[PDB]
Write a protein that holds these residues in place. Structure first.
Motif, short mmCIF file in Angstrom:
data_model
loop_
_atom_site.label_atom_id
_atom_site.label_comp_id
_atom_site.label_asym_id
_atom_site.label_seq_id
_atom_site.Cartn_x
_atom_site.Cartn_y
_atom_site.Cartn_z
N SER A 22 0.88 -1.21 0.00
CA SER A 22 0.00 0.00 0.00
C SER A 22 0.90 1.24 0.00
N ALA A 23 0.59 2.20 -0.86
CA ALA A 23 1.39 3.42 -0.94
C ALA A 23 1.40 4.12 0.41
N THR A 24 0.30 4.00 1.15
CA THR A 24 0.20 4.64 2.45
C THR A 24 1.19 4.06 3.43
N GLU A 25 1.20 2.74 3.55
CA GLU A 25 2.12 2.09 4.46
C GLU A 25 3.58 2.44 4.15
N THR A 26 4.01 2.17 2.92
CA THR A 26 5.39 2.46 2.52
C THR A 26 5.77 3.92 2.76
N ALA A 27 4.95 4.86 2.30
CA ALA A 27 5.24 6.27 2.49
C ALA A 27 5.43 6.52 3.97
N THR A 28 4.46 6.07 4.77
CA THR A 28 4.52 6.23 6.22
C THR A 28 5.84 5.68 6.75
N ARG A 29 6.13 4.41 6.45
CA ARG A 29 7.37 3.78 6.89
C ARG A 29 8.59 4.66 6.61
N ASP A 30 8.65 5.23 5.41
CA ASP A 30 9.77 6.10 5.03
C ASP A 30 9.82 7.29 5.95
N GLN A 31 8.68 7.94 6.11
CA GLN A 31 8.57 9.12 6.94
C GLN A 31 8.97 8.87 8.39
N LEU A 32 8.39 7.83 9.00
CA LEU A 32 8.71 7.51 10.38
C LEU A 32 10.17 7.11 10.54
N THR A 33 10.71 6.39 9.56
CA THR A 33 12.11 5.99 9.64
C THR A 33 12.96 7.23 9.59
N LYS A 34 12.72 8.06 8.57
CA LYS A 34 13.47 9.31 8.39
C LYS A 34 13.43 10.14 9.67
N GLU A 35 12.22 10.34 10.19
CA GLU A 35 12.06 11.11 11.41
C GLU A 35 12.85 10.53 12.58
N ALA A 36 12.75 9.22 12.78
CA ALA A 36 13.44 8.55 13.89
C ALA A 36 14.97 8.64 13.83
N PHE A 37 15.51 8.80 12.63
CA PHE A 37 16.95 8.91 12.51
C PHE A 37 17.38 10.27 13.00
N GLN A 38 16.46 11.23 12.95
CA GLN A 38 16.75 12.60 13.33
C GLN A 38 17.00 12.74 14.81
N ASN A 39 16.66 11.69 15.54
CA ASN A 39 16.90 11.62 16.98
C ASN A 39 18.03 10.61 17.07
N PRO A 40 19.26 11.09 17.21
CA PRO A 40 20.43 10.22 17.29
C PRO A 40 20.38 9.14 18.39
N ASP A 41 19.29 9.11 19.14
CA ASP A 41 19.15 8.13 20.21
C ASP A 41 18.53 6.83 19.72
N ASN A 42 17.87 6.84 18.56
CA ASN A 42 17.25 5.62 18.01
C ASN A 42 18.24 4.96 17.05
N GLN A 43 19.49 5.37 17.12
CA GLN A 43 20.48 4.85 16.19
C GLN A 43 21.51 3.91 16.76
N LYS A 44 21.66 2.75 16.12
CA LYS A 44 22.66 1.78 16.54
C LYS A 44 23.95 2.48 16.17
N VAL A 45 25.00 2.20 16.91
CA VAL A 45 26.25 2.88 16.67
C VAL A 45 27.41 1.89 16.57
N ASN A 46 28.57 2.37 16.14
CA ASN A 46 29.76 1.55 15.98
C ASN A 46 30.95 2.07 16.73
N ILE A 47 30.87 2.05 18.05
CA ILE A 47 31.93 2.49 18.96
C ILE A 47 33.31 1.90 18.66
N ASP A 48 34.30 2.73 18.35
CA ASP A 48 35.63 2.20 18.08
C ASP A 48 36.49 2.10 19.34
#
Lengths: 183, 63, 64
Positions: free
Chosen positions: C1-27
Motif C-alpha cells: 500500500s502506498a500509504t504504508e510504505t510512504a509512512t514507513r519512510d517518513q517515520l524511519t526518516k524522522e526517527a533517525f533525526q533523533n540520534p538516540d534511536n540509532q545503533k552505533v559503531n563504537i571504536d
C-alpha cells in the motif's frame, strides 16, 4: 668560593619529559623547568614580565602569553643570570566552546588551518592536561578550519589537545568543541 | 505531493550510509550520531524529490 | 500500500533525526560512529505504525 652561576640551555618539558630547548611553537600555559648551576646552590627565580611568563621558586616556568621575556635566576652568593625566552612562531589559546561559526568570530578567523598545527603542539608539549592550567580536564576537542568540501557539507574537522583523536565530519553546531585560536 | 514521499525515501537511504551523516561530540571528545545529514546531501535529496514531483505530476496529467 | 510504505519512510526518516534511536559503531578510542541502522525496538515499532496507516487507508476507502 663558588662557581659562576649558569642556567642550562636545555629545558625539561613537563608534559612529556623531553629534555631539549624551548619549543618554537607554544601551548599557552605549557610548562618547563630551567636548571640553574653554579653559585651557592640556593636559588630564587622571577620573570620580568608576568603577562608573558611566570616562574615558581623551584624553577618551573609557565607560558602566559605570546611575546618575549626574561627569566632571572639568583643565587645566595649574589649572582644574577638571565635566561631569555624569545617569542614563539605561533601560540595555542583555548577559548570558549563554540559552534564553528562562533569559533571563527571569537578567533578573528585564526582557527588552525591544518591539523598539523595542533598535532605539532602535541608532539612538542604532550596532553594539555599534563599542565597546571588544564590539569583537571579530560578532553579539549578543538576546531580545524574548514575546507571547501567540509564547508559545502556543513561540517569541519577536529583534533584533541588532550587525547588527540582527530575526527572528520563534525557537525559545525556540536557542543563540546573549543575555539582554539592561533596567534 | 509525491516529492514528499521521494524526499522521505531518499533521506532514509541517505541515513543508511554512515558517511552522509554529520557527527557530534560528547564531553569526552568522542563522536556520536547527530541526527543531521550533511548539507550537500540534503540539497541533492531536494533536487531529486522536486524533480520527481514534476515527473509524476506533469506526467499523470497526460489525459 | 502506498500509504504504508510512504509512512514507513517518513517515520524511519524522522526517527533517525533523533540520534538516540540509532545503533552505533563504537571504536577503540570511544568513538560511537553511526552504523546506519536503527535500534530494533524502533524498526519494530515503526513497522506497526506503517501497517496501521495502511489499514486506516483501506478501511477509509471501504467506507465509501
Amino acid at each position: 668560593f663558588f662557581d659562576e652561576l649558569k642556567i642550562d640551555n636545555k629545558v625539561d618539558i613537563i608534559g612529556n619529559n623531553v629534555r631539549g630547548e624551548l619549543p618554537n611553537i607554544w601551548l599557552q600555559y605549557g610548562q618547563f623547568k630551567l636548571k640553574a648551576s653554579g653559585g651557592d646552590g640556593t636559588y630564587s627565580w622571577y620573570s620580568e614580565n608576568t603577562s608573558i611568563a611566570t616562574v615558581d621558586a623551584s624553577g618551573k616556568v609557565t607560558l602566559n602569553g605570546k611575546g618575549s621575556v626574561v627569566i632571572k635566576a639568583t643565587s645566595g652568593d649574589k649572582q644574577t643570570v638571565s635566561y631569555t625566552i624569545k617569542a614563539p612562531s605561533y601560540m595555542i589559546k583555548v577559548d570558549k566552546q563554540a559552534y564553528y561559526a562562533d569559533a571563527m568570530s571569537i578567533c578573528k578567523n585564526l582557527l588552525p588551518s591544518t591539523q598539523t598545527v595542533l598535532s605539532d603542539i602535541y608532539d612538542s608539549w604532550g596532553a594539555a592536561n599534563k599542565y597546571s592550567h588544564y590539569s583537571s580536564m579530560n578532553s579539549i576537542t578543538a576546531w580545524i578550519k574548514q575546507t571547501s568540501s567540509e564547508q559545502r557539507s556543513g561540517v569541519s574537522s577536529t583534533y584533541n589537545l588532550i587525547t588527540q583523536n582527530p575526527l572528520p565530519g563534525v557537525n559545525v553546531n556540536t557542543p563540546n568543541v573549543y575555539a582554539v585560536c592561533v596567534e | 505531493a509525491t516529492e514528499t514521499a521521494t524526499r522521505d525515501q531518499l533521506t532514509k537511504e541517505a541515513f543508511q550510509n554512515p558517511d552522509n551523516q554529520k557527527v557530534n561530540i560528547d564531553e569526552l571528545g568522542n563522536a556520536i550520531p547527530s541526527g543531521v545529514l550533511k548539507d550537500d546531501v540534503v540539497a541533492n535529496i531536494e533536487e531529486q524529490a522536486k524533480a520527481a514531483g514534476e515527473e509524476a505530476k506533469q506526467q499523470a496529467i497526460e489525459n
